[PDB]
Write an enzyme that holds these catalytic residues in place. Structure first.
Site, mmCIF file in Angstrom:
data_model
loop_
_atom_site.group_PDB
_atom_site.id
_atom_site.type_symbol
_atom_site.label_atom_id
_atom_site.label_comp_id
_atom_site.label_asym_id
_atom_site.label_seq_id
_atom_site.Cartn_x
_atom_site.Cartn_y
_atom_site.Cartn_z
ATOM 1 N N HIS D 247 0.860 -1.163 0.000
ATOM 2 C CA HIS D 247 0.000 0.000 0.000
ATOM 3 C C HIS D 247 0.915 1.238 0.000
ATOM 4 O O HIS D 247 1.853 1.299 0.789
ATOM 5 C CB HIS D 247 -0.923 -0.022 1.224
ATOM 6 C CG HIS D 247 -2.026 0.985 1.176
ATOM 7 N ND1 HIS D 247 -1.821 2.326 1.415
ATOM 8 C CD2 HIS D 247 -3.347 0.846 0.925
ATOM 9 C CE1 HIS D 247 -2.968 2.973 1.301
ATOM 10 N NE2 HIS D 247 -3.912 2.096 1.012
ATOM 11 N N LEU D 257 -1.581 2.752 8.513
ATOM 12 C CA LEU D 257 -2.137 3.077 7.213
ATOM 13 C C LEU D 257 -2.759 4.453 7.183
ATOM 14 O O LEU D 257 -3.401 4.879 8.153
ATOM 15 C CB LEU D 257 -3.222 2.085 6.838
ATOM 16 C CG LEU D 257 -3.920 2.430 5.513
ATOM 17 C CD1 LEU D 257 -3.121 1.889 4.332
ATOM 18 C CD2 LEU D 257 -5.357 1.940 5.468
ATOM 19 N N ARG D 291 -2.554 0.538 -6.929
ATOM 20 C CA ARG D 291 -1.629 0.515 -5.791
ATOM 21 C C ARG D 291 -0.190 0.109 -6.147
ATOM 22 O O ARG D 291 0.767 0.706 -5.646
ATOM 23 C CB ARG D 291 -2.166 -0.396 -4.674
ATOM 24 C CG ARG D 291 -2.561 0.370 -3.425
ATOM 25 C CD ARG D 291 -4.048 0.566 -3.222
ATOM 26 N NE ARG D 291 -4.572 -0.496 -2.379
ATOM 27 C CZ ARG D 291 -5.551 -0.366 -1.484
ATOM 28 N NH1 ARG D 291 -6.176 0.793 -1.269
ATOM 29 N NH2 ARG D 291 -5.902 -1.431 -0.786
ATOM 30 N N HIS D 358 0.705 -4.587 2.953
ATOM 31 C CA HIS D 358 -0.671 -4.265 3.337
ATOM 32 C C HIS D 358 -1.692 -5.377 3.155
ATOM 33 O O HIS D 358 -2.428 -5.660 4.098
ATOM 34 C CB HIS D 358 -1.113 -3.050 2.549
ATOM 35 C CG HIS D 358 -2.517 -2.605 2.829
ATOM 36 N ND1 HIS D 358 -2.852 -1.835 3.922
ATOM 37 C CD2 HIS D 358 -3.656 -2.761 2.118
ATOM 38 C CE1 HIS D 358 -4.142 -1.562 3.887
ATOM 39 N NE2 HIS D 358 -4.653 -2.112 2.803
HETATM 40 C C1 LIG Z 1 -5.223 -0.503 7.759
HETATM 41 C C2 LIG Z 1 -5.977 -1.354 6.769
HETATM 42 C C3 LIG Z 1 -7.030 -0.836 6.075
HETATM 43 C C4 LIG Z 1 -7.724 -1.626 5.180
HETATM 44 N N1 LIG Z 1 -8.748 -1.014 4.562
HETATM 45 C C5 LIG Z 1 -9.494 -1.660 3.678
HETATM 46 C C6 LIG Z 1 -10.602 -0.967 3.022
HETATM 47 O O1 LIG Z 1 -10.823 0.225 3.319
HETATM 48 N N2 LIG Z 1 -11.328 -1.647 2.137
HETATM 49 C C7 LIG Z 1 -11.054 -2.932 1.847
HETATM 50 O O2 LIG Z 1 -11.768 -3.527 1.004
HETATM 51 N N3 LIG Z 1 -10.035 -3.620 2.424
HETATM 52 C C8 LIG Z 1 -9.223 -3.059 3.337
HETATM 53 N N4 LIG Z 1 -8.150 -3.736 3.956
HETATM 54 C C9 LIG Z 1 -7.956 -5.143 3.595
HETATM 55 C C10 LIG Z 1 -9.081 -5.936 4.281
HETATM 56 O O3 LIG Z 1 -9.515 -5.277 5.463
HETATM 57 C C11 LIG Z 1 -8.706 -7.314 4.766
HETATM 58 O O4 LIG Z 1 -7.962 -8.007 3.767
HETATM 59 C C12 LIG Z 1 -9.987 -8.057 5.099
HETATM 60 O O5 LIG Z 1 -10.673 -7.303 6.094
HETATM 61 C C13 LIG Z 1 -9.721 -9.461 5.616
HETATM 62 O O6 LIG Z 1 -10.819 -9.932 6.382
HETATM 63 P P1 LIG Z 1 -10.931 -11.489 6.774
HETATM 64 O O7 LIG Z 1 -12.355 -11.740 7.235
HETATM 65 O O8 LIG Z 1 -10.340 -12.335 5.657
HETATM 66 O O9 LIG Z 1 -9.931 -11.771 7.997
HETATM 67 P P2 LIG Z 1 -9.431 -10.699 9.069
HETATM 68 O O10 LIG Z 1 -10.396 -9.555 9.154
HETATM 69 O O11 LIG Z 1 -7.949 -10.452 8.854
HETATM 70 O O12 LIG Z 1 -9.591 -11.540 10.410
HETATM 71 C C14 LIG Z 1 -9.053 -12.851 10.433
HETATM 72 C C15 LIG Z 1 -9.774 -13.647 11.491
HETATM 73 O O13 LIG Z 1 -9.186 -14.933 11.505
HETATM 74 C C16 LIG Z 1 -8.891 -15.301 12.848
HETATM 75 N N5 LIG Z 1 -7.697 -16.167 12.932
HETATM 76 C C17 LIG Z 1 -6.512 -15.968 12.333
HETATM 77 N N6 LIG Z 1 -5.664 -16.975 12.651
HETATM 78 C C18 LIG Z 1 -6.310 -17.832 13.460
HETATM 79 C C19 LIG Z 1 -6.004 -19.098 14.161
HETATM 80 N N7 LIG Z 1 -4.786 -19.690 14.067
HETATM 81 N N8 LIG Z 1 -6.992 -19.649 14.900
HETATM 82 C C20 LIG Z 1 -8.208 -19.099 15.024
HETATM 83 N N9 LIG Z 1 -8.536 -17.954 14.415
HETATM 84 C C21 LIG Z 1 -7.653 -17.291 13.640
HETATM 85 C C22 LIG Z 1 -8.682 -14.006 13.588
HETATM 86 O O14 LIG Z 1 -8.967 -14.211 14.969
HETATM 87 C C23 LIG Z 1 -9.628 -13.054 12.882
HETATM 88 O O15 LIG Z 1 -10.921 -12.970 13.508
HETATM 89 C C24 LIG Z 1 -7.362 -3.047 4.915
HETATM 90 C C25 LIG Z 1 -6.277 -3.578 5.614
HETATM 91 C C26 LIG Z 1 -5.605 -2.758 6.532
HETATM 92 C C27 LIG Z 1 -4.404 -3.162 7.315
#
Ligand SMILES: Cc1cc2nc3c(=O)[nH]c(=O)nc-3n(C[C@H](O)[C@H](O)[C@H](O)COP(=O)(O)OP(=O)(O)OC[C@H]3O[C@@H](n4cnc5c(N)ncnc54)[C@H](O)[C@@H]3O)c2cc1C
Ligand code: HEM
Ligand SMILES: O=C(Nc1cccc(Oc2c(F)c(F)c(F)c(F)c2F)c1)c1ccccc1C(F)(F)F
Ligand code: SF4
Ligand code: F3S
Ligand code: FES
Lengths: 129, 153, 250, 616
Positions: D247, D257, D291, D358
């Site tokens: 990013h 970020l 990006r 990112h």
């Molecule tokens: C600062 C920032 C801003 C962002 N902004 C945006 C945005 O504005 N728009 C956009 O589209 N995307 C954005 N992204 C990217 C996006 O937010 C993420 O890629 C997305 O939210 C991922 O969601 P997820 O449900 O895959 O897992 P995450 O939201 O990463 O959560 C993962 C889950 O898995 C669980 N987990 C992990 N490992 C284990 C384990 N070993 N055992 C049990 N549980 C586990 C965790 O407890 C957690 O609840 C951003 C990222 C960052 C850092």
């Protein structure tokens, strides 16, 4: 090794299952309103009892201070009379004691009015020192 | 009669007792602040004023002593004038402060003045005026009584 | 050599007859970041890896790392370390919570109480799920400003003496302010039933306007204002406005 | 499993979800709605998940600001992928974007509003109206600066109605496999040390990214690639891990970020000569280029002595020219973050920023129904019975070589839901819950024990820091074949030092020394597989830039006309998904390659988009 026991779900609050028979209607709303309105009405009654003394103010202070303090201590008693810390019956015994406090407070005030100088007078007499 | 969550909360506390877990320190460790020190005072005062009225009320009835001999006793002790007005000020402040702060807290119950500046103004104000009024009520008669000790007339 | 010293509450449940205790730790401020989380990680990494805390984000958004630093409830990750090394910053868990280990408090009542406000949108006339946006004006959505920002860190509830003495019955500022956040949501049809849930003498009314919650909140938010706002609604001194009507073209 | 004893607890669920980010909770809502006994396993309270840290927005063609088409969003998604993306998955995503985002609002999500009362939308990087012909698009739906925070809390709340059962602060150790078929998950309960086996008909992996593999990133501490380590240890090859999204604007000192939305409201980047330099590197889109482009432009400007600050080693995101009203209304989150971390009033000064790791396009591979797959040349795609995966941990692949801002939150919900739709329809009450194999999970315990009591002379925090420094140095924004190869060397050494591991905390109860080492194990798998895939890709595509192979290598040379060329065979060109297969014991990594799915789901609804030269 994996020769072990079947476990249960962790303890968790189901807020919808709580809704299955949660009738109870017990609004403490109106009571909270009077408690405050009564204290608001006592705002003038302090300077008043400074400037105008007598046996009829002595009676108005006693009626008002009794009823206010009654609510007051009941609240303090519910913060420090916790079943968790005192157990169930002793916390009910502290609750009951709240009412004893109110009823004895009045008794002792009425007595002091009737058979002694009175509140407003007793104040003068320490102020004259 | 408890809400379902309030039943749940109770069991929680019991489960916690079962697990012998300590409770994280609070009064002994939390920073003294104008927020909870003043609410600390509001409860102290309100209670001390109750306590006095109950002890005082029931005391002078249950004892053979009356108020007039009690007032005479400490007068007879001939204690310094300034010290006597300090005791008066201590008696007056709780009445002034709790009453003043009581309107402040009613304001809070109505969502008025709850921003941090307001909180801190109303605290200093209510605390300040209480002290002011208690001084006035203790020092006004003593200025009116020294106006007879030595005087133009 | 700018050596800062930290006193950190410790508790090990594995140890038999174990008691809490304070542990001093020295940290070289010139090889350590600026925020108190950075000291906690450094200490865990270089000195003592038994040191145990919650953390996740770096930017003060997740809420994982709430704890008591120098008397106040704040977040480690955005709490600036006190440069003055003749002082020793004290680090305790969130006040009056049962502790699991070191600075990690059991947090499940807080979460349960949160469940009990039913933190989700409700509609009396069933809506067709994917199909269209519910109308809401700007001003109506701006009533949500100051409310939806809450990260559920529990600094405020854990600062509230009312909540110390009656966690099991008083809901506390974090949950109450969220309770209010659904109540003034123009789109939510259930203000009545939401208020009914906290009619009793404790749920909301045990708020003795101590105001610690609004002082300590690390997100510069105001639970106390929401709670007063709730009390008015409960006493019927106020009522929720009806939702502005959805235009016929919309 | 010898040097200590472990309590083991068995559970029987219809479907176990590993993760409670945007994706995991969306799947959970779908399943619980549809009647299933759903468990949600998560190493942290769902709200803490990284979704909550998201800022800029979520993309949908609602046309609240100006008229739009989802097919325009389809285009921009595909172009952004640099044609490594699977167009059938990108189709599914963008078609379902308007519904999904509206569903979110319908769940109570407090979106910023326009004066007509519809969902406010901002401009964002690498999107356009009318297939790259028209102007800068406005599809990025937001709740100001905190779109993820709100989304996650909206979703978490709404999940408390689906009677979905939560196992919170349970660290997942491994998928329970029975002859190529996932029958559940085994996990460590942090509260009380107990090890838990969950028997399920379906398992959904929704664990997020592996951004902590790098020294500097925007990701959470919890972004340790656990879910892909899970899939690796289950004998599943991972896809496109060399595609790491840098990013553009992470804060220089710390990593925090700053949202692309800040450029999308009129902010821009500025070098030392005081130039809005993005007008050179990208004349049409400027500071709203993709990006991977903007982060490079920045990286060059540093290299060529136009960096800013004392060391002249970063650049300025400049917002101060925008009015305070807008700055406060659209960007209150980063205003405060800039203040707290860089000492910057954004109304008066610029924010020091620098390309920061990112997002992760790579992950567990799946088909468009989010079903995890194995691949051979002979068999082709082959589903892994029982295993689904979605969110950042997955690779559908909807982002291919480069993710589009505000597609990830979208990706998480659409496919998170898609998991629940596809399971509702494939799972019937006839099929009962899998009784476990004998011994199932015994090895994961063995690993725990060994790591818990680890003797060696290398502490877990040290070996993590070299991994992170290595990755940073040898697999950054620009990569060269020798730096890569040396990087692969050093990295396969660090995989040996795992056998010289030292932990100190010996407790079972809330032992974060233990778990942070399981995370280091999981990170090494992710990182190793990342760098050898990176070493081997002799081309430049999306976020993967090779100085020694600057060109994008496709079947044809799409810079010249199509008619009159000979299609290069699969083996010669690089328009193909990388598959990395690692033996978890030895660390050895093989490679293979799987073709990109170019066809849409339904040509009747929308045509596919043939590759062209990617310019913004
Ligand atoms: C600062 C920032 C801003 C962002 N902004 C945006 C945005 O504005 N728009 C956009 O589209 N995307 C954005 N992204 C990217 C996006 O937010 C993420 O890629 C997305 O939210 C991922 O969601 P997820 O449900 O895959 O897992 P995450 O939201 O990463 O959560 C993962 C889950 O898995 C669980 N987990 C992990 N490992 C284990 C384990 N070993 N055992 C049990 N549980 C586990 C965790 O407890 C957690 O609840 C951003 C990222 C960052 C850092
Ligand atoms: C004259 C105007 C007065 C006003 C406006 C007033 C107002 C209030 C209010 C609003 C409270 C409740 C606040 C809370 O819940 O923390 C309170 C509590 C109390 N008041 Fe008063 N009060 C007055 C006078 C008095 C007097 C003369 C006494 C004498 C004994 C008294 C005793 C108490 C007590 C014991 C409490 C309970 C304390 C607590 O729970 O914190 N008050 N008062
Ligand atoms: O914390 C408040 N007072 C307070 C402060 C310090 C000590 C204290 O005594 C204790 C105590 F030391 C204990 F160890 C107890 F076990 C206990 F039960 C007490 F009561 C009360 C307080 C302050 C202001 C307003 C409202 C309160 C209230 F009511 F309680 F919520
Ligand atoms: S209110 Fe402030 S403090 Fe209480 S939870 Fe929400 S954020 Fe943490
Ligand atoms: S700290 Fe406590 S009692 Fe009320 S106003 Fe604040 S919640
Ligand atoms: S670690 Fe996220 S709030 Fe401090």
């Amino acid at each position: 090794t994996s020769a072990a026991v079947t476990g249960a779900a962790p303890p968790q609050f189901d807020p919808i299952a709580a809704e299955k028979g949660f009738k109870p209607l017990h609004s403490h709303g109106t009571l909270f309103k009077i408690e405050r309105y009564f204290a608001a009405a006592m705002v003038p009654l302090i300077p008043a009892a400074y400037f105008i003394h007598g046996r009829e103010m002595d009676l108005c202070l006693a009626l008002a201070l009794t009823l206010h303090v009654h609510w007051g201590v009941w609240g303090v008693v519910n913060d420090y009379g916790r079943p968790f810390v005192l157990g169930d019956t002793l916390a009910a015994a502290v609750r009951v004691g709240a009412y004893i406090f109110t009823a004895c407070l009045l008794a002792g005030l009425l007595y002091f009015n009737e058979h002694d100088v009175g509140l407003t007078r007793a104040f003068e007499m320490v102020w004259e020192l | 009669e408890k809400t379902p969550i309030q039943v749940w909360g109770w069991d929680y506390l019991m489960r916690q007792r079962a697990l012998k877990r300590p409770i994280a320190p609070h009064l002994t460790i939390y920073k003294p602040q104008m927020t909870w020190m003043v609410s600390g005072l509001h409860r102290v005062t309100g209670c001390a004023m109750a306590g006095t009225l109950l002890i005082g009320g029931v005391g002078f009835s249950v004892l053979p002593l009356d108020f007039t001999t009690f007032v005479e006793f400490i007068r007879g002790l001939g204690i310094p004038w300034v010290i006597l007005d300090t005791f008066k000020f201590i008696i007056a402040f709780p009445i002034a402060f709790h009453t003043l702060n009581g309107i402040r807290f009613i304001g809070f119950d109505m969502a008025k003045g709850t921003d941090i500046p307001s909180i801190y103004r109303g605290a200093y104000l209510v605390l300040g005026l209480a002290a002011l009024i208690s001084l006035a009520v203790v020092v006004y008669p003593r200025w009116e009584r020294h106006k007879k000790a030595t005087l133009p007339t | 050599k700018r050596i800062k010293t930290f006193e950190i509450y410790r508790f090990n449940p594995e140890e038999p007859g174990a008691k809490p205790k304070l542990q001093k730790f020295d940290v070289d401020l010139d090889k350590c970041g600026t925020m108190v989380l950075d000291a906690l990680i450094k200490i865990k990494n270089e000195v003592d890896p038994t040191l145990t805390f919650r953390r996740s984000c770096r930017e003060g958004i997740c809420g994982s790392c709430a704890m008591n630093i120098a008397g106040e409830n704040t977040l480690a990750c955005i709490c600036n370390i006190d440069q003055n090394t003749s002082k020793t910053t004290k680090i305790y868990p969130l006040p009056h919570m049962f502790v699991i280990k070191d600075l990690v408090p059991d947090m499940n009542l807080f979460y349960a109480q949160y469940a009990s406000i039913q933190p989700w949108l409700q509609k009396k006339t069933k809506i067709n799920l994917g199909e269209k946006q519910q109308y809401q004006s700007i001003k109506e959505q701006e009533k949500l400003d100051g409310l939806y920002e809450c990260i559920l860190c529990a600094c405020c509830s854990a600062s509230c003496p009312s909540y110390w003495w009656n966690a099991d019955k008083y809901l506390g500022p974090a949950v109450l302010m969220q309770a209010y956040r659904w109540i003034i949501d123009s789109r939510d049809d259930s203000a009545a039933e939401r208020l009914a849930r906290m009619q009793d003498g404790f749920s909301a009314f045990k708020c003795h306007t101590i105001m610690n919650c609004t002082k300590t909140c690390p997100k510069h938010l105001n639970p106390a204002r929401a709670i007063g706002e709730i009390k008015m609604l409960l006493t019927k001194m106020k009522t929720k406005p009806a939702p502005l009507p959805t235009p016929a073209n919309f | 499993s010898n040097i200590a004893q472990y309590k083991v607890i068995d559970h029987a669920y219809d479907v176990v979800i590993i993760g409670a980010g945007g994706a995991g909770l969306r799947a959970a809502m779908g399943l619980g709605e549809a009647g299933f006994k759903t468990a949600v396993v998560t190493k942290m309270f769902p709200t803490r998940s990284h979704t909550t840290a998201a800022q800029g927005g979520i993309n949908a063609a609602l046309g609240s600001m100006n008229p739009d088409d989802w097919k325009w969003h389809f285009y921009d998604t595909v172009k952004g992928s640099d044609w490594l993306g699977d167009q059938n998955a990108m189709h599914y995503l963008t078609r379902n974007a308007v519904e999904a985002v509206t569903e979110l609002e319908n769940f109570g999500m407090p979106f910023s509003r326009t004066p007509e009362g519809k969902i406010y939308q901002r401009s964002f990087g690498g999107q356009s109206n009318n297939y790259g012909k028209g102007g800068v698009a406005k599809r990025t739906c937001c709740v100001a600066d905190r779109t993820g925070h709100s989304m996650l809390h909206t979703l978490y709340g709404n999940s408390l109605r689906c009677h979905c059962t939560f196992f919170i602060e349970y660290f997942a150790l491994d998928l329970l496999m029975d002859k190529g078929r996932c029958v559940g998950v085994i996990a460590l309960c942090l509260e009380d040390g107990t090890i838990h086996r969950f028997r399920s008909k379906r398992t959904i992996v929704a664990t997020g990214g592996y951004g902590r593999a790098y020294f500097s990133c925007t990701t959470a501490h919890m972004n340790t690639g656990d879910g892909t380590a899970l899939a690796t240890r289950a004998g599943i090859a991972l896809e496109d891990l060399e595609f790491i999204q840098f990013h553009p604007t992470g804060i220089y000192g710390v990593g925090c970020l700053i949202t692309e939305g800040s450029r999308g409201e009129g902010g821009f980047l500025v070098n030392s000569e005081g130039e809005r330099f993005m007008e050179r590197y990208a004349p049409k889109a400027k500071d709203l280029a993709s990006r991977d482009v903007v982060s490079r432009a920045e990286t060059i400007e540093i290299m060529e002595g136009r960096g800013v600050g004392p060391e002249k080693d970063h650049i300025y995101l400049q917002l101060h020219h925008l009015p305070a009203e807008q700055l406060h209304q659209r960007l209150p989150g980063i205003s405060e973050t800039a203040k707290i971390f860089a000492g910057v009033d954004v109304t008066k000064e610029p924010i020091p920023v620098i390309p920061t790791v990112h997002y992760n396009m790579g992950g567990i591979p799946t088909n468009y129904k989010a079903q995890v797959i194995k691949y051979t040349k002979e068999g082709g795609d082959k589903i892994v019975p029982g295993l689904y995966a979605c969110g950042e941990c997955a690779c559908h692949s909807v982002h291919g070589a480069n993710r589009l801002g505000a597609n990830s939150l979208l990706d998480a919900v659409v496919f998170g839901r898609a998991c629940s739709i596809n399971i509702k329809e494939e799972l019937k009450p006839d099929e009962k819950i899998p009784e476990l194999p004998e011994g199932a999970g015994e090895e994961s315990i063995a690993n725990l024990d060994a790591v818990r009591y680890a003797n060696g002379d290398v502490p877990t925090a040290e070996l993590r820091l070299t991994m992170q420094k290595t990755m940073q140095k040898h697999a950054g924004v620009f990569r060269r074949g020798d730096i890569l190869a040396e990087g692969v060397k050093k990295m396969m050494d660090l995989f040996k030092e795992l056998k010289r591991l030292k932990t100190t905390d010996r407790s079972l109860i809330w032992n974060s020394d233990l778990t942070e080492s399981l995370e280091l194990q999981n990170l090494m798998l992710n990182a190793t597989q990342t760098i050898v895939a990176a070493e081997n890709r002799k081309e430049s595509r999306g976020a993967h830039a090779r100085d020694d192979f600057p060109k994008r290598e496709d079947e044809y040379d799409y810079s010249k006309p199509i008619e009159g060329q000979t299609k290069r065979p699969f083996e010669k060109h690089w328009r193909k998904h990388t598959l990395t297969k690692q033996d978890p014991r030895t660390g050895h990594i093989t490679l293979d390659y799987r073709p990109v799915i170019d066809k849409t789901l339904d040509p009747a609804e929308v045509d596919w988009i043939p590759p062209i030269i990617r310019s913004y």
